[PDB]
Amino acid sequence: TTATRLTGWGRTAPSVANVLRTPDAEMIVKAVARVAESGGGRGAIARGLGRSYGDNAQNGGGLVIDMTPLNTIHSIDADTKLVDIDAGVNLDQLMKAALPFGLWVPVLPGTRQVTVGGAIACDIHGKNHHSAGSFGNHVRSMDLLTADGEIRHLTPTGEDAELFWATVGGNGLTGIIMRATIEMTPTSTAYFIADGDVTASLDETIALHSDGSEARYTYSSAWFDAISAPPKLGRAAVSRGRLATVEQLPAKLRSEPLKFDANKYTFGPIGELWYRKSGTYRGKVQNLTQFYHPGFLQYQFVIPTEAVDEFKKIIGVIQASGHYSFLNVFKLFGPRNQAPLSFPIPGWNICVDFPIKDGLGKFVSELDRRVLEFGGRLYTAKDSRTTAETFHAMYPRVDEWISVRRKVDPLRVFASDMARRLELL
Ligand SMILES: Cc1cc2nc3c(=O)[nH]c(=O)nc-3n(C[C@H](O)[C@H](O)[C@H](O)COP(=O)(O)OP(=O)(O)OC[C@H]3O[C@@H](n4cnc5c(N)ncnc54)[C@H](O)[C@@H]3O)c2cc1C
Ligand SMILES: O=[NH+]c1cc(C(F)(F)F)cc2c(=O)nc(N3CCN(S(=O)(=O)C4CCCCC4)CC3)sc12
Numbered sequence: 001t002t003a004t005r006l007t008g009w010g011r012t013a014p015s016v017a018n019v020l021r022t023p024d025a026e027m028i029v030k031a032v033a034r035v036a037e038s039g040g041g042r043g044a045i046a047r048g049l050g051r052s053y054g055d056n057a058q059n060g061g062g063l064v065i066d067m068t069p070l071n072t073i074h075s076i077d078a079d080t081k082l083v084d085i086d087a088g089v090n091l092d093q094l095m096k097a098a099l100p101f102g103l104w105v106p107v108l109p110g111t112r113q114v115t116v117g118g119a120i121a122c123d124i125h126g127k128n129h130h131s132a133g134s135f136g137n138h139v140r141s142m143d144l145l146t147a148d149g150e151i152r153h154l155t156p157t158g159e160d161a162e163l164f165w166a167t168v169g170g171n172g173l174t175g176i177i178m179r180a181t182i183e184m185t186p187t188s189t190a191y192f193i194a195d196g197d198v199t200a201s202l203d204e205t206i207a208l209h210s211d212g213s214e215a216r217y218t219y220s221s222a223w224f225d226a227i228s229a230p231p232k233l234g235r236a237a238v239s240r241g242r243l244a245t246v247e248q249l250p251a252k253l254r255s256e257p258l259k260f261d262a263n264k265y266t267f268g269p270i271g272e273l274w275y276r277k278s279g280t281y282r283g284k285v286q287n288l289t290q291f292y293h294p295g296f297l298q299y300q301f302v303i304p305t306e307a308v309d310e311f312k313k314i315i316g317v318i319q320a321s322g323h324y325s326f327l328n329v330f331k332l333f334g335p336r337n338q339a340p341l342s343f344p345i346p347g348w349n350i351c352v353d354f355p356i357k358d359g360l361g362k363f364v365s366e367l368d369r370r371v372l373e374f375g376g377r378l379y380t381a382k383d384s385r386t387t388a389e390t391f392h393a394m395y396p397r398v399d400e401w402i403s404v405r406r407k408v409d410p411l412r413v414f415a416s417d418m419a420r421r422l423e424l425l
Contacts, residue, residue, distance in 0.1 A: 006064060010053035010298055013384045015060025015417055019047075023069035025178060032176065033149040035063060036413045043415030046176045048115030049090060052122065053298045054384040055417035056171040062415060065176060067117050074179075076101050081184045082140065087117035087177045095288075099258045103184035104243065106138040108292065110329075117177045122381040123169035123342045127292065130334030131218040132185070134344050136168030137337050142180035147413035151178060166404040168339035171380055173405055173414050173424055187243045189257045192219065192291040194241035198279040202234020202315055206308060209332045218242050219291070224328035226318055226352060233319050234312075236330055237279045239294075244285060253285070261287050297354040299364060300382040301371045302333055304347040310374035311348040317370060318352065321363050325352040340397035340404075343379045351382070361385070380418060388423035398424070 004019045020031055035044050042062030049068060050057060058064060070088040077083075078101040085094060092112035095105045109124045118124075120142065125134040132138075144152050144167055152175075154164040167174045195217070199205040205222065214220055217240035225235045246257045265271045303311040318325070329351040336345045354360055368390050371378065377394035378386055392398050402424065412425050419425050 004064075006047070006050075006058040008053045008055060008057065008384060009051050010296065010384065012053075013055045013058075013417065015055075015058050017059050017062055017064040019064045019066055021066040021069055025070060028065055028070075028176065028178070029145060029149060029151070031063065031065065032145060032147070032413065036147050036149060036411060040412035040415070043413050044176075045414060045416040046087075046117060046121070046172045048088070048118035048121075049113050051111060051114045051118065052381040054380055054382065055421065056122075056380055056419075057118075058417050059415055060417055067115060067176070070178070073097055076103065078102055081186060082181055083184060084179070084181050085116055086179050087115060089116050090114060091116070091119065096260055098184055099190055099260060101184075102186055102188060102258065104187040106132055106183070106185045107135040108288075110293070116180055116182070117172075120168055120177055120180065121170060121172045122379075123337070123339055123344070124381070125333070125344045127219040127221040127331065129344055130214060130220065130332060133335065133337055134342060136165070136339055136342065138183050139164075139168070140181045140183050142167065143178045144174065145176040145178055147175065147409040147411060162404055163408060165337075165339045166341075166401055166408075168337070169342040170339075170401065170405070171341075171418060171424075172416065173419050174408055175414060185243075187258075188246050189244045189249060189253075190260050190287060191244045191249060191253065191257070192241040192286045192288075193244045193248055194239060194281075194284045194286050194291055196279050196281040196284065197238040197240075198236070198276045199238065200235045201231045202312060205234050205236040205238070205330065206312070208238060214240070214332060216240075220331065222330040223294075224330040224350060226315065226325045226328045229319060230316070234315050237275075239291070241286070241291060249285060261289070295356055297356055297360055297364065298351065298382050299354060299367065300349070300351045300379040301367075301376050302343070302345055302347050302349040303371070303374050303376040304345060305332070307347070307374050307376075310370075314367070314370055314374065315350075317367070323354045323357070323360055323363060325354055327353045340401040341380075341395055343377060343381075345377070347376070380422075384418075384421075386422075388421065391422045 044063035045059040047057040067088040070086045074084040119135045220240040222236040222238040
């Protein structure tokens with residue numbers, strides 16, 4: 001145990017906590033039993049690799065259990081497609097161990113430096129959400145250490161389904177996920193076949209994503225112009241694809257198919273042509289880094305699908321705001337799952353990255369308001385400054401969730417800055 005100052009990736013909202021770090025699960029079981037006996041008393045919260053920007057993995061004046069020591073891969077099985085892994089396993093470790101079995105991590109986020117625990121607790125998503133859903137959809141079982149000190153073996157359709165789906169996306173506030181079983185996606189290669197497309201306006205970007213062409217791709221995302229004024233506003237470089245088969249690989253690659261490996265023109269018409277040519281293509285074979293991985297306030301929201309005029313209004317609001325975001329990711333989500341606090345819903349999702357400067361705070365509070373008004377929501381993994389009232393209206397099943405949480409932790413053994421800020425205890 002060590003008094004430490006914790007922050008999310010965005011290095012904001014620091015608090016000091018007693019960070020327990022042990023590879024012995026039993027010591028984690030005791031640590032919880034010591035907290036549950038001494039009242040709530042600021043409680044405890046699990047931490048993974050600290051990739052949430054927010055305050056969901058910190059607990060000012062309480063216990064923070066570092067789960068990364070507990071990183072044993074117990075088994076992988078290519079016939080069942082199941083991996084059995086401790087919660088502190090990360091998706092890069094997992095991805096590399098699973099490939100020799102013909103198995104693919106079913107949901108990968110923009111970084112592979114996240115733990116399995118954090119992937120479940122934030123119910124993370126990726127470029128294949130419209131074809132695969134989020135991470136919780138592929139969990140077949142997890143062992144949850146609850147406030148009573150018992151370890152419950154939960155399944156998605158068992159008798160404890162309710163607690164299972166409260167843990168999916170429950171930012172650790174139902175207990176510590178010790179271990180889980182995931183169903184992987186079968187693959188014969190570590191490569192993608194990608195199609196690329198460049199649009200010139202927001203209206204075209206929208207139109208490309210509503211042709212029906214998204215149904216031909218399992219992975220899809222886009223880089224998104226949020227600075228340029230209309231008509232350029234919302235032009236995008238779209239990148240869509242599928243996991244390749246061995247047959248579609250070049251000869252050089254079919255022997256190890258599963259192995260993991262002019263500036264004055266830029267803003268002128270010649271730059272426009274180059275960007276469009278380089279960004280337009282078909283059938284390009286790419287490994288994971290090339291396909292998936294090509295001071296600040298990180299902000300992410302989704303607008304339900306039908307509300308397209310509303311989504312266009314929000315992009316216009318951002319462009320006229322005087323806050324310039326260069327690194328913006330756009331994607332059309334597909335169906336949601338049954339976790340009450342799961343962030344993804346079918347509709348228009350986008351991430352923006354704002355330089356911290358005067359007026360930004362108040363401008364993002366207004367963004368919150370328009371996002372809420374238009375039926376959307378923010379992502380806890382990206383947030384540390386929204387209000388409980390805003391969050392509770394964005395998430396109309398919160399009360400349903402809070403009820404489950406109070407049954408399993410009546411003494412508030414599990415707690416985080418986020419839970420206090422967002423009124424989730
Ligand atoms: C560069 C970057 C790109 C990202 N891209 C994406 C993306 O494409 N899609 C997406 O959905 N997210 C994305 N994220 C967010 C990230 O995937 C999530 O925040 C994820 O939860 C981080 O995992 P972690 O192990 O770092 O968890 P932490 O940040 O350490 O913790 C996050 C939450 O998980 C809980 N938790 C962790 N381990 C356990 C456990 N064993 N038991 C119970 N609760 C636990 C914590 O209590 C906390 O509530 C990105 C983040 C960054 C920095
Ligand atoms: O956040 N919302 C997202 C939503 C999706 C979705 F919807 F498709 F699923 C996908 C992604 C993704 O795939 N990757 C992301 N990253 C964030 C930061 N960086 S960086 O910009 O590359 C780098 C920063 C510092 C130096 C300069 C460049 C690394 C990657 S975010 C993201």
